[PDB]
Amino acid sequence: PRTVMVNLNIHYYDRSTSPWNLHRNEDPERYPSVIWEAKCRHLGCINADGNVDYHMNSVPIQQEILVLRREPPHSPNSFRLEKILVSVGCTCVTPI
Amino acid sequence: PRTVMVNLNIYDRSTSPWNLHRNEDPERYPSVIWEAKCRHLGCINADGNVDYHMNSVPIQQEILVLRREPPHSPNSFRLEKILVSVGCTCVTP
């Protein structure tokens, strides 16, 4: 147990060939409770003509992020640090 | 004001590829954050060549981190928002 104190008071890509939308992911047992996650708009990538090219793939960029998990569950003042995978945007990839 | 206890015990084929840079900050938890840096200004063509007709742009995301409060404190923090480069996307200029 590595217990620390934390004060919780804090103090564009539309032209992408692999564009994305943001999805509201909510968890009451987590701090921060809301995490906005990227979801690729298409399976393929946008052409020079503005069309979807299915020989290319829009893939989500997944990053490991540290979040706070209520420990014990429902606790207003006690947490454990947790690693979660979050989709942070989309990139365009050549298939294997 | 809002003090809580925290237990600290826990794309190569891209047209806009990136490299990871280890960003270090002693006054931050986590001290180590891997940040993306676009390999090129352009995007990779169907031919495997860098094409200046398109741009690799970093995707910047706001992340919650812990800032040592008071400074240098091993066990006391304040929640902070920082901008981190998390990958690269390819954009039409």
Q: Which domains does chain B have, with CATH numbers?
A: 11-93 (2.10.90.10)
Query: Which residue of B lies nearest to A55 if distances are taken between CA atoms?
Result: B46
What string of DSSP letters covers chain A?
A: --EEEEE------TTBSS-EEEEEEE-TTEESSEEEEEEES-SSEE-SSS-EETTSEEEEEEEEEEEEEESSTT-SSEEEEEEEEEEEEEEEE---
Contact B30, B65 (CB under 8 A): yes
Among B28, B43, B64, B82, pick the best mutation site for testing chain A contact (most A Cβ within 10 A): B64
In angstroms, how far is the first alpha carbon of chain A from the final one? 44
Buried (b) or exposed (e) across B32-56, using 16+ Cβ within 10 A? ebebbebebebbbeeeeeeeeebbb
What's the resolution in A?
A: 2.5
Residue B44 identity (one-letter amino acid): I
Q: Report the distance separating Cα A39 and Cα A22, nearest Å.
A: 6
Close Cβ partners of A50 (under 8 Å, ≥ 6 residues apart)? none
Residue B61 has which token pair? Answer: 């995301």
